[PDB]
RNA sequence: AGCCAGGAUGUUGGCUUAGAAGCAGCCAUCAUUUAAAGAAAGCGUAAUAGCUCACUGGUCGAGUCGGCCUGCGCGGAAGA
């Protein structure tokens, strides 16, 4: 590694690649086609599934196109399909909202097996221990 | 269809003609041969050397409504163009030139009319100056 | 913080990492960056762990005058800027090449490998230690004795020996 | 106190010829160079200057810290010298120096020529920067100032007569 | 600048030192906060 | 006090969000990585930013910080 040159992260959802109404002209200019981050992007995207976000860096240098290498998704998004209700705060913690415990997105805390600053595998678990409070969802834990 | 190349508004305080060059040939597609070249630019330009003539004619001030008078300095190297132009100027205007004999091209009548290469000329048209 | 209360604390509780220390190294970080703990602390997870600390404690002061615990030539031992390391679990190994094979590479000044206790001297690094585990250096290293060790020579007088 | 107690040591050269209350410092290069006192008792012995207060005096200290650091950078004036160095901002600006009088064009109707003090001199390592080294720190420091101001940075273009250890703030218009 | 009865330092780059018989405030980051008298 | 270094990772935090990935914003401020790093100070984003602050290390080495009680002064303070 070395520290910056080139890379962001903008996007809604993996059921559509490379929105035309969303990001539009607001996906990548000084190196990103927008008829090219789709041809790299559903190479391996469409090797899992369609529906989730899926942030990225983009390694630039000046050799027409790019390169990237993205990693393990927010366990933030993954409470709109392995949790509860579609949205998420909205209703922070003034009523207790939905309400995930112990065993609930535990294995959602095993994804992120080299992507967790975490060493202690039993301790990487404080670490998502909050990627679904930002909306208030006590743990019956 | 052949382009010839006029870089106007030397009047004026410009990009490096250097930089001016591969904006041409680079994002035209085209080459670039000079004919003239700038000697200093904005309230410092003092006029241009013709690389083909070998020698330079003097830029006056405020004369755009009628044509100048026509005042020439012979040599790249005569002792009156550092007089001129001070030698500050005349020694850019030789270094740049040994710069660009570097990185140009001569101008071919052919290469022109087969719109390969555009001769460029650099000037003022308010100055009426290189017209 | 807190005073003699605190001191003391930086002192005894990492100075246990000294009486019962496996290995020992003394490392200046002058110009280091978070990588420097996205390094040791990396290599924490898929080869290492929370077994081992470099906590910049180099106040000298409290740590070179906090080491009661037997480890003498240390009077000198703690020169300037410094960032100790030690390790509890495990054996005696690896950990000098996660520095030997880090700062080699820019990262920073080494200390130039000032050594440190197990055996207790001074500097100029060693790697004996390292070979550990990688037992197919022991197997080799009988250099077939008959074998290999033979048709490497005594079998060389005919690619280079016949003139 | 501080920096008037810590000595000021008399490196291998310089003369240092304190007399009773005018001291003068020569060496390497420089013309010499000495400056005056008042409220402060200098000492040379040995290898160094020490610097002191004197009875009856509220300016000590005060008066000899400042006496330190002058000798201080007087030793080291003659020693090693003091650097300079300015650059040149924005098309159409240029230094020369054709003597010790330094040529500038800054965008006037007019050149700008500017005649270097005594003990001062410069180069234009490029048509857009001066150095000027000299031993006299107070004068350096002057000569800069006062090229510089012919023509200093305006805050939206950057354009102008800088150091190097600058800053230039710059910002942008009002919004249409 | 702005001349004020009570100058104070607004930034923390706002620095206050008296040249002559007078108490100014010289910030560094905001020209703005240049004041005199006080 | 200078001077020398670091200030992230879970996280682009989700959110009335056209787009917000710390900072016109809402509600929240918890947990690792560590010597220290706040979903956090400021400049300023089309938006990331680049780049600097609390706090920790290093260098230097004796004092340093701010309130309280008192004495004497400074500005505030322009006229026929």
Avoid at chain 1, 88 to 113: C, H, M
Avoid at chain 2, 51 to 59: I, Q
Avoid at chain 4, 72 to 84: A, R
Wanted: proline share 4%; with cysteine; hydrophobic share 40%.
């Amino acid at each position: 590694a070395k520290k910056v040159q080139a890379y962001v992260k903008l996007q809604v959802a993996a059921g559509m690649a490379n929105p035309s109404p969303p990001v539009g002209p607001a996906l990548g200019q000084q190196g990103v086609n927008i008829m090219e981050f789709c041809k790299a992007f559903n190479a391996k995207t469409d090797s899992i599934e369609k529906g989730l976000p899926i942030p990225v860096v983009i390694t630039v240098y000046a050799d027409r196109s790019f390169t990237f290498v993205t990693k393990t998704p927010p366990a933030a998004v993954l409470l709109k399909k392995a949790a509860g209700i579609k949205s998420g705060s909205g209703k922070p913690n003034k009523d207790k909202v939905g309400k995930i415990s112990r065993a609930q997105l535990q294995e959602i805390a095993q994804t992120k097996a080299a992507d967790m600053t975490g060493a202690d595998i039993e301790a990487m678990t404080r670490s998502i221990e909050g990627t679904a409070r930002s909306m208030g969802l006590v743990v019956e834990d | 269809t052949p382009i010839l190349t006029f870089m106007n508004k030397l009047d004026r305080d410009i990009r490096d003609p250097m930089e001016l060059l591969d904006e041409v040939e680079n994002e035209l597609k085209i080459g670039c041969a000079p004919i003239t070249w700038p000697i200093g630019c904005g309230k410092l330009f003092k006029g241009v050397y013709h690389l083909y003539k070998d020698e330079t004619y003097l830029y006056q001030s405020g004369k755009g409504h009628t044509i100048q008078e026509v005042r020439i300095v012979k040599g790249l190297n005569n002792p009156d163009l550092d007089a001129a132009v001070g030698e500050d100027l005349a020694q850019q205007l030789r270094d740049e030139l040994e710069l660009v004999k570097g990185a140009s091209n001569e101008f071919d009548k052919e290469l022109f009319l087969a719109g390969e290469i555009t001769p460029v000329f650099f000037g003022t048209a308010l100055g009426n100056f290189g017209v | 913080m807190a005073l003699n209360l605190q001191d003391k604390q930086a002192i005894v509780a990492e100075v246990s990492e000294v009486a019962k220390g496996a290995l020992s190294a003394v490392v200046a970080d002058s110009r280091g960056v978070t990588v420097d703990k996205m390094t040791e602390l990396r290599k924490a997870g898929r080869e290492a762990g929370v077994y081992m600390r470099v906590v910049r404690n180099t106040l000298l002061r409290r740590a070179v005058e906090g080491t009661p615990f037997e480890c003498l030539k240390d009077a000198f031992v703690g020169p300037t800027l410094i960032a100790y390391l030690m390790e509890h679990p495990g054996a005696a190994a690896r950990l000098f090449k996660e520095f030997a094979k880090a700062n080699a590479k820019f990262e920073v000044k080494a200390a130039a490998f000032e050594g440190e206790l197990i055996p207790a001297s001074q500097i100029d690094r060693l790697a004996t230690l390292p070979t550990y585990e990688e037992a197919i250096a022991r197997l080799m290293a009988t250099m077939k004795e008959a074998s290999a060790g033979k048709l490497v020579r005594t079998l060389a007088a005919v690619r280079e020996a016949k003139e | 106190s501080r920096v008037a107690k810590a000595p000021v040591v008399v490196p291998a050269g310089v003369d240092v010829k304190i007399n009773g209350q005018v001291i003068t410092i020569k060496g390497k290069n420089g013309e010499l160079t000495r400056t005056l006192n008042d409220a402060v008792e200098v000492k040379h012995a040995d290898n160094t200057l020490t610097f002191g207060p004197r009875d009856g005096y509220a300016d000590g200290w005060a008066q000899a810290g400042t006496a330190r650091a002058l000798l201080n950078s007087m030793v080291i004036g003659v020693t090693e010298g003091f650097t300079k160095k300015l650059q040149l901002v924005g098309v159409g600006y240029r230094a020369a120096v054709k003597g010790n009088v330094i040529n500038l064009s800054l965008g006037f109707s007019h050149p700008v020529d500017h005649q270097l003090p005594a003990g001062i001199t410069a180069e234009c390592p490029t048509q857009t920067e001066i150095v000027l080294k000299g031993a006299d720190k107070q004068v350096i420091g002057q000569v800069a100032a006062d090229l510089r101001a012919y023509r200093r940075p305006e805050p939206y273009k950057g354009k102008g007569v800088r150091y190097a250890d600058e800053v230039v703030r710059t910002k942008e218009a009002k919004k249409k | 600048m702005k001349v004020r009865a009570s100058v104070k330092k607004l930034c923390r780059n706002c620095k206050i030192v008296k040249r002559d018989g007078v108490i100014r405030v010289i910030c560094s980051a905001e020209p703005k906060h240049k004041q005199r008298q006080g």
